Structure 1
């Protein structure tokens, strides 16, 4: 790389008063990734196709028609990556298991080569002293199950998932003591079934078909039941003997009332219900949020008393993926003709107040830099859900894909992001929030779904021509902060 790559950024040594002592005893610091975004070997090693494999095939889906067939190729360079995490001082790694790498068809025949890969990765993490946190699902439904019965839209998916989870618990549970069923089921449901932005690409307008008024809610209901069923397998068959824990990863945008008026306040609350409460109300209270039931009515499925009891308290902790915040306005009189899940919120967004932007924007269209939002978000969870045990399970920001190694590694905006968000998180914790861990998204620049390689979330720069890794200033900022 050009000589400027190796300039020593003094920001690295500015920890803003953060250290392991500033956090609770045994607090875990990690990084997070997912199978599809980092593994490569998409069509190799016995892996069956997922809905993203099919979705990507349609031209124009991913910028420059890029694929995740190789991506950053962690399938082969997992040792190097784990070595980087260790060298940077991280305690843990949240990865995901590809359902279709284990069961090419989703059910039945186990792909042993796939199992051997996860076994290698986990064994090496353990050997290096990195704690494995395993997520079972991160957007990668086996295509076969979508072909058979439309995947998440069928109640058949529930036991298919439980069986898959069950297998993972018995295969990997002797060393994996921390499990998650789903990463961001809200996004699976909304992006997958409301606006068709993610695989399977369904919505009211969409080429693949769909109905934005009903399918997101059906998907979500089955994801909640699938989660509950997986957790039941774990609790009844494995947990007492393996002595691990299980939870779920929920994305949570902070919604701030645009003003102190009752309408704006109620607008902010309604967005929280539709975004987070959709999933966390069932899990903590056994029921869907009140606003949702009243607005969506018959377009939302109902739990039986038996399902409600299975879902309630079906976590040992909750992962909160948090990045950003928006202002929320009452939008005025509601039009009540069913349009979409997003429209069902009946809120207006705002990104500035008194000519002042809520924060600077990162590369991603949705990502505003608002450190105080993490404090509000976590405090909200503490106060609303009975102070649950929490993991701050994703946090980070992106640069554009079109930067060189030389400029890409000097990501001082990212140092600032982490310093400020972690600082705001520390305050929430200091004020009583039972946060037990924090995970940065992500170790490496990787395949960023619809944005492909036009977005760089890593604290480590990856040259996509050579797949060489170059730690950014933010990686060294962590190494210094954590030592």
Structure 2
């Protein structure tokens, strides 16, 4: 069957199914409704930064159309919706004055979701640092971010937490560190070569450390001030793509494990165990910040659940670990990613060049976290694939590859859960075609098609697949 035996009965009782968006990628009204600019507004408005010089000024206009979109997700039998709050829509300068119109938007969205029986899962941050904070403080390079973020989090807890019971602090701090401060291809465009300045060997580590400390501080505030009354939960969202040793050699198995540690362990070892992975300590040395005992105790156990964004997989090839002059976070791993084995590609690519369709990577990642980290509560917070630009409406709607993608990946997730993985939910990226960062509107991740001329929504085949699979 096109469902391939999948249904709600195939997953645990009360397992949560949802869809996901992020504020800058879908809201629009970027310079309206009192919203202050984020680092992404400045970046996207700079010629050459985004495909077609596009930006999120309008995006999908969810700001005006949110009731349509909530009605749609309910009609598709989802239980939950993961979305983010734009920090600069609430605090235009990132601190100080509250934009009441911004608060009203999120109140209206949250209240409508609840009215329609859809549980809000709310990210506080999804790349969209208020521009004022980047300029005034230097953003995530400044340890002061922990205070600034905690104050923002506190406001959101006080204002929405009587209704919102499932929070996340950050989204993919690895990608912020990597693209923002190693490669310099996402804002603030810092790197060793870069015009904005930077240092690809040091700054990614500073940035990751500050995300961890900020997360911990916000959760401490939640727990000491709000949790008794509100009885909700706060986690964090981390990207994890699977790494499989290219061969069974000692060097290749070591390489795969080293890649896992530099990718997910970077955040999970502090969050679960109260220290950075040993291999990162050994190789990165003085460039890896040291948690004080007090900080390590604040960070350890500070996530009520682990959000995992799972998309793809690669093989890893190793070599002799060698003494080398530091150049970058990326180079620190001392591995080589490989995308074929025995002359066969690991999987076909979706529109995004990085996205190889490898359903067994989902099993790989979930099983690994179960076995390595004491089976913490995991929520699959993003999973999905993209179509290319310039197709017809009907070609977008007949998204057979995406149907196959979800069936295959969810079957692999089911396999891991049946083997005892503590997975509490799954969220499809994305509800809607949207603004896909550097790709702008040239990458289509939605289960719902968005016509970017008219802004009309049209559910794709994959949307109806979910509707069938999820019927109560």
TM-score, normalising length from structure 2? 0.99
CA distance in structure 1 between the partners assigned to 2:26 and 2:356 by the alignment: 25
**Deviation sequence 1:25-70 (CA, Å, 0-9, x none):** 1000000110000000111111111111111222111111111000
CA distance in structure 1 between the partners assigned to 2:169 and 2:251 by the alignment: 36
CA distance in structure 2 between the partners assigned to 1:143 and 1:408 by the alignment: 35
CA distance in structure 1 between the partners assigned to 2:321 and 2:295 by the alignment: 36
Name the structure 1 match of 2:254. 266
Name the structure 2 match of 1:119. 107
The one of 426, 432, 440 equivalent to 2:420 is 432
CA distance in structure 2 between the partners assigned to 1:69 and 1:334 by the alignment: 47
1:128 aligns to 2:128 (yes or no):
no
> Displaced runs of 4+ in structure 1, greater than 3 A?
331-335
CA distance in structure 2 between the partners assigned to 1:214 and 1:38 by the alignment: 33
Counterpart contact for 2:251–2:319, Cα < 8 Å: no
1:223 aligns to 2:211 (yes or no):
yes
1:313 aligns to 2:322 (yes or no):
no
**TM-fit CA distance, 1:333:** 5.5
CA distance in structure 2 between the partners assigned to 1:190 and 1:421 by the alignment: 26
Listed as ranges, the matches of 1:202-213 within 5 Å are 202-213=190-201
The one of 97, 109, 126 equivalent to 1:138 is 126
CA distance in structure 2 between the partners assigned to 1:470 and 1:401 by the alignment: 16
**TM-fit CA distance, 1:207:** 1.5
The one of 418, 422, 427 equivalent to 2:410 is 422
Name the structure 2 match of 1:249. 237
CA distance in structure 2 between the partners assigned to 1:274 and 1:349 by the alignment: 13
The one of 269, 273, 277 equivalent to 1:285 is 273
**TM-fit CA distance, 1:334:** 3.6
CA distance in structure 1 between the partners assigned to 2:448 and 2:417 by the alignment: 28
1:445 aligns to 2:433 (yes or no):
yes
What is the SS of the residue equivalent to 1:452? helix
Name the structure 1 match of 2:324. 336
CA distance in structure 2 between the partners assigned to 1:297 and 1:474 by the alignment: 47
1:201 aligns to 2:211 (yes or no):
no
CA distance in structure 2 between the partners assigned to 1:363 and 1:331 by the alignment: 31
**TM-fit CA distance, 1:210:** 0.7
Name the structure 2 match of 1:4. none
Counterpart contact for 2:45–2:54, Cα < 8 Å: no
Counterpart contact for 2:434–2:446, Cα < 8 Å: yes
Counterpart contact for 2:86–2:128, Cα < 8 Å: yes
What is the SS of the residue equivalent to 1:301? coil
The one of 354, 371, 380 equivalent to 2:359 is 371
CA distance in structure 1 between the partners assigned to 2:37 and 2:182 by the alignment: 23
The one of 380, 403, 406 equivalent to 2:394 is 406
What is the SS of the residue equivalent to 2:32? coil
Name the structure 1 match of 2:157. 169
CA distance in structure 2 between the partners assigned to 1:192 and 1:233 by the alignment: 28
What is the SS of the residue equivalent to 1:419? helix
TM-score, normalising length from structure 1? 0.97
Name the structure 2 match of 1:386. 374
Name the structure 2 match of 1:6. none
Name the structure 2 match of 1:81. 69
Q: Which runs of 5+ in 1 are unaligned?
A: 1-12
**TM-fit CA distance, 1:14:** 1.2
The one of 326, 336, 339 equivalent to 1:348 is 336
Listed as ranges, the matches of 1:28-43 within 5 Å are 28-43=16-31
What is the SS of the residue equivalent to 1:400? coil
1:93 aligns to 2:51 (yes or no):
no
CA distance in structure 1 between the partners assigned to 2:230 and 2:390 by the alignment: 46
CA distance in structure 1 between the partners assigned to 2:381 and 2:55 by the alignment: 26
CA distance in structure 2 between the partners assigned to 1:285 and 1:73 by the alignment: 42
Tell me the number of residue pairs that the alignment of Structure 1 and Structure 2 aligns.
471
CA RMSD in angstroms, aligned pairs only: 0.8
The one of 443, 454, 460 equivalent to 1:466 is 454
**TM-fit CA distance, 1:335:** 5.7
What is the SS of the residue equivalent to 1:280? helix
